[PDB]
């Protein structure tokens, strides 16, 4: 079982990051969403891969 | 640039709302035989 490297990469442009500055936790909220979406990626790669 | 104002608005885009009025206000009315007619005066103009 080659523990191959899966490349997960996410970026948040400065325009979209300063456009939505009205929220005090925008980075935090998108971080949690990405964490959970990576869990779903683990499931979905395990089956659909 | 020292005279120019600076402000730390924490929003990328906004508007500036000024109230103003719609014109003359004071006007006597014949309250004995006429109602006191009331008219709104707030011309909220919005910049960007």
């Amino acid at each position: 079982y080659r523990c191959e490297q899966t490349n997960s990469d996410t970026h948040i442009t400065y325009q979209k990051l300063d456009a939505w500055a009205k929220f005090a936790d925008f980075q935090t909220r998108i971080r949690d969403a990405i964490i959970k979406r990576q869990a779903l990626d683990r499931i979905m790669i395990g089956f659909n891969g | 640039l020292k005279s120019i104002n600076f402000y730390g608005v924490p929003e990328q885009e906004g508007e500036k709302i000024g109230l103003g009025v719609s014109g003359p206000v004071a006007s006597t009315t014949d309250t004995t035989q006429q109602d006191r007619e009331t008219s709104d005066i707030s011309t909220m103009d919005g910049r960007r």
Partner: peptide, 19 residues
């Protein structure tokens, strides 16, 4: 002019990964 909206942030829940 605009009554321009007030916006609150809420996360649309992704599928639960309890599996």
């Amino acid at each position: 002019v605009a009554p321009s909206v007030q916006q609150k942030l809420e996360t649309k829940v992704q599928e639960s990964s309890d599996f």
